Amino acid sequence: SGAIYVGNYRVVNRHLATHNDWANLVWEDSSRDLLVSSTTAQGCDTIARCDCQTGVYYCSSRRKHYPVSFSKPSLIFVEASEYYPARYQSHLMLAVGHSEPGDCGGILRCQHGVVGIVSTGGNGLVGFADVRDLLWLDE
Ligand SMILES: CS(=O)(=O)c1ccccc1CC(=O)N1CCC[C@H](C(N)=O)C1
Ligand SMILES: [Zn+2]
């Protein structure tokens, strides 16, 4: 579990979004596993605007932060689940690192700020849904 709070927005994994998130819906994309909802309070997370391929992510199943090298955002096949049928997920970045069910929502950051959130994983791999192209989160 976990979310990004920037201005009047809350960014969460779409498969984990709440009733309140859906009642205050701004934008959602099943192919990216992202949902953004509106908030009354101000969020102070800074979003990165860069092409960094190194950073640090939070792993709740280990209660630790890990440094990682990650790939550029791309279309990657993701196996079926109680949340989605088998499909390609867009804007996805992979890294060699630990992750397991329960870790989605952990933030990935570089020196410039928030890069994305854990969205997929397994087999000594971790997948991050990128948020750096969502320029409207600032304005
Ligand atoms: C079971 S796992 O793949 O090792 C793992 C690891 C870390 C974190 C999660 C998972 C499970 C997983 O990948 N998904 C279930 C939830 C929706 C995800 C999606 N984006 O389509 C896909
Ligand atoms: Zn960066």
Curated annotation (Swiss-Prot):
Catalytic activity: Selective cleavage of Tyr-|-Gly bond in the picornavirus polyprotein
This protein's name: Protease 2A
Function: Cysteine protease that cleaves viral polyprotein and specific host proteins. It is responsible for the autocatalytic cleavage between the P1 and P2 regions, which is the first cleavage occurring in the polyprotein. Also cleaves the host translation initiation factor EIF4G1, in order to shut down the capped cellular mRNA translation. Inhibits the host nucleus-cytoplasm protein and RNA trafficking by cleaving host members of the nuclear pores. Counteracts stress granule formation probably by antagonizing its assembly or promoting its dissassembly.
Active site: 15 (for protease 2a activity), 33 (for protease 2a activity), 104 (for protease 2a activity)
Binding site for Zn(2+) 1: 50, 52, 110, 112
The protein's assembly and partners: Homodimer.
